[PDB]
Amino acid sequence: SATANSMNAVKDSLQRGQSTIDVALAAGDTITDLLGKMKEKALAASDTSLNTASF
Amino acid sequence: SATANSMNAVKDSLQRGQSTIDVALAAGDTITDLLGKMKEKALAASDTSLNTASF
Incomplete structure (x- = not known):
């Protein structure tokens, strides 16, 4: 019975890990859009027909 | 998806090249008329029956 009761802490830990990964994936959406x-x-700046101000 | 989005810069570059060539062709119309x-x-000046003032 004590072993069965201690699984509540295991479930709490696994849910905490899922929340941490959710926050990381939310940050990763921002980072992949920025990249x-x-x-x-950089693709536009590699063109040599741009003037200095556009570059 | 990022590869597809970067084609917008490629299209911008190709349109810029078409504009540069358009300006060169507009100058070339003037230059061929002048030539x-x-x-x-020079054809009129090669005639020897012209007097000095006409030449």
Whole structure:
């Protein structure tokens, strides 16, 4: 019975881990969007027909 | 998805190149007209029956 009761703490820990990963995935959506925009910036800047102000 | 989004910069570059060539062709119309007029000037000046003032 004591062994069965201690599984409540195990469940609490696993749910805490799922919450931590949820916050990391929410940050990762922001980071992958930012990286796609930065790739578009570097791709546009590699063109040599741009003037200095656009670069 | 990031690869598809970066094609917008490729399209921007190709349109910029078309604009640069358009300006060059507009200048080239002027230059070919001027060269045709200069050929008419040299052709008239090669005649030896002209007096000095006309030449």
